[PDB]
């Protein structure tokens, strides 16, 4: 019981320090800011090739090719500009929760309930998509396997453990077992040296790829965290949870700095993303419509109300030219302003 | 425009392949098999394959030339409040419970309650398989274990007229069977609003007619779905 008492004392010290830092609120340093105003993003192009509920997508580095994963068991790579379907990869397991596009655009990763992340090569000399690699070893369902480079993939699984994998040898290069619940999604910082993840315990943790140890922990949420994304600079990240409230966390501050919630909003958040400045926190909701908020003033900026079912996956191009939303109605929609 | 024309041609081929996949996808039905450790869902899976940390196992079977995909959760943690949401468009959920064990029966009842009350499972009928009936009958005949202690409401229970006892079945065994079935049906009907129904069946681990019952339940579910879709219900 001594260890429990020591842990309680350390938690009290953590709380006291974090309080000692907190003098002012983001809302105050930002009260002197002009509101963004109503955002009137409209649907420019619509993709209807998918069969079942889409569950994951990832914009490419070129902001022209996108990858979408659908539970029919299909990974479709679309050309956003011309609506043409660049590729269609059938998947061995119909249940897919995550998909990622390599920075160079040569490899595409996917994963789901199979507890495996499968990587396919698009630049084969034959011109046909094939299973380049299969990574196994996780004892839980893969919720997000993202790319760092062509030969190294970081993944989050439902065994409360995250992994870094070398793809040539196919073994677990690094392992992270600090969480106590299902890790739901992770985001890589642009520096490609730290990454932040969230678990089904109202807890987010920061991890170092090279070292392999937990850096910081944040427990500001009430319910399970489903979405996480890194603010452009890499020093902050937004989190969405089933409690219907989003939050903003900063690594250096080590505590929450914003909360986005409303009385009318009762549904949780499935996917979150930031814009190229960080002034537009877009977030999916189970109410079948996405909402974009002013990240600095916590003022609702716009609502994308075109969707028939729960929005699952949200993506923003590298240049922030368009926002792509994929819901359970087997339709991806590209939204842009005027 | 040669590159553009090639791009549109490739898109057309991909569209044709996706249309083939569409026809295949609508030609098969998806079912989710769930149960506890005590429940003999593995035995059912073995006896229905007569037509590594994998995580999920898939059974392909066929009844009346209708293809059925069953998915069984494998190397996954006890937590189930999140991945279950992937099974929101399955045709049906086959829930297997061990009626012989009076202890842990309340756990199965609570699991059924959670499944029924789940937001994303409100539009999916649940097929109920009360398994291990022979063990329940033997336990009732022995009399060593009494349902009254676990379920004090069982004392006042009486077999309803709707009950159809099997030939050569002791009144006590059928009374207990239908008491447990009514316990399940109370939860089934408490939240049912016309978009959710249960199919109570008395089944055994060694049974060759479970597939027929599953096919009939799927037929009824799709019949109701068509009734609603074709402006009749």
């Amino acid at each position, epitope marked *: 019981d001594q260890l429990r008492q020591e842990a309680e004392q350390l938690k009290n010290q953590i709380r006291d320090a974090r309080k000692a830092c907190a003098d002012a609120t983001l809302s105050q340093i930002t009260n002197n800011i002009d509101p963004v105003g109503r955002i009137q993003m409209r649907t420019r192009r619509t993709l209807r090739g998918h069969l079942a509920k889409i569950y994951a997508m990832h914009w490419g580095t070129d902001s022209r090719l996108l990858v979408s994963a659908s539970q029919d068991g299909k990974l479709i790579i679309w050309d956003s500009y011309t609506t043409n379907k660049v590729h269609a990869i059938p998947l061995r397991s119909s249940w897919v929760m995550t998909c990622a596009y390599a920075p160079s655009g040569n490899y595409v990763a996917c994963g789901g309930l199979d507890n495996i992340c499968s990587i396919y090569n698009l630049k084969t000399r034959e011109g046909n998509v094939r299973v380049s690699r299969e990574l196994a070893g996780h004892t839980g369902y893969l919720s997000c396997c993202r790319f760092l480079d062509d030969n190294q993939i970081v993944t989050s699984s439902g065994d409360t453990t995250c992994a870094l994998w070398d793809i040539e040898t196919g073994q677990q290069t690094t392992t992270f077992t600090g969480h*106590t*619940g299902d890790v739901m999604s992770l985001s890589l910082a642009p520096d490609t040296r730290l990454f932040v993840s969230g*678990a*089904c*315990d*109202a*807890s987010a943790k920061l991890w170092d790829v090279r070292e392999g140890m937990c850096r910081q922990t944040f*427990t*500001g*949420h*009430e*319910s*399970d965290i489903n979405a996480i994304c890194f603010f452009p600079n890499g020093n902050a990240f937004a989190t969405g949870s*089933d*409690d*219907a409230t989003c939050r903003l966390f900063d690594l250096r501050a080590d505590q929450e700095l914003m909360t986005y919630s409303h009385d009318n909003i*009762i549904c*949780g958040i499935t996917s979150v993303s930031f814009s190229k400045s960080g002034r537009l926190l877009l977030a999916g909701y189970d109410d079948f419509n996405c909402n974009v908020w002013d990240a600095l003033k916590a003022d609702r900026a716009g609502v994308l109300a075109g969707h028939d079912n729960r929005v699952s996956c949200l993506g923003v191009t590298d240049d922030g030219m368009a926002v792509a939303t994929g819901s359970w109605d087997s339709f991806l929609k590209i939204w842009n302003g005027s | 425009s040669a590159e553009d024309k090639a791009a549109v041609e490739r898109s057309k081929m991909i569209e044709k392949q996706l249309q083939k996949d569409k026809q295949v996808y609508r030609a098969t039905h998806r079912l989710l098999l769930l149960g506890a450790d005590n429940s003999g869902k593995s035995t059912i899976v073995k006896q229905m394959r007569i037509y590594k940390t994998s995580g999920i196992f898939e059974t392909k079977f066929q009844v009346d030339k209708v293809n059925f995909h069953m998915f069984d959760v494998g190397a996954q943690r*006890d*937590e*189930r*409040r999140k991945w*279950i949401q992937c099974f929101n468009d399955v045709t049906a959920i086959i829930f297997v419970v061990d009626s012989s064990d009076y202890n842990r029966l*309340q*756990e199965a009842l*609570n*699991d059924f*309650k*959670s*499944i*029924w*009350n*789940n*937001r994303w499972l409100r539009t999916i009928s649940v097929i109920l398989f009360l398994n291990k009936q022979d063990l329940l009958a033997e336990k009732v005949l022995a009399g060593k274990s009494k349902i009254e*202690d*676990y*379920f*004090p*409401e069982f004392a006042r229970y009486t077999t309803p007229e709707d009950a159809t006892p099997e030939p050569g079945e002791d009144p006590r065994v059928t009374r207990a069977k239908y008491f447990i079935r009514d316990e399940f049906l109370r939860i089934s009907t408490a*939240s049912g609003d016309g978009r959710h129904y249960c199919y109570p069946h008395f089944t055994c681990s060694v049974d060759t007619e479970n597939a027929r019952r599953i096919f009939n339940d799927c037929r009824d579910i799709i019949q109701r779905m068509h009734l609603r879709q074709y402006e009749l219900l």
Partner: nanobody
Amino acid sequence: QVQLQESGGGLVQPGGSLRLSCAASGFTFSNYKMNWVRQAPGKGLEWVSDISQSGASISYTGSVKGRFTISRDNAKNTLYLQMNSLKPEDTAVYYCARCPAPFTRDCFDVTSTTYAYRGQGTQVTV
């Protein structure tokens, strides 16, 4: 942040009467349907009873029916469970648990081996 602390317990002779309290901090007590669990020596976690947000809907396991009762105090952020006619076979570590999500009628993993929204628990002995 989230913290559930249980209070009460101690040795009691068979047939006594006790009251166990459950204080919650971090979330909103009202929006969450809460339960009671118990782990008994040589046995696993068992679902005792539940109470909803409004408190007008209750359910008990028959083994503790007619004997124990559940109440909620949203203003005090506190759950209460009365123990009456206590039997020796009701000796266990009692845990306070809440349903994963708010405004939700389903609670799946309340009885799992590990649950990130359950308190330390208190040892009630008889």
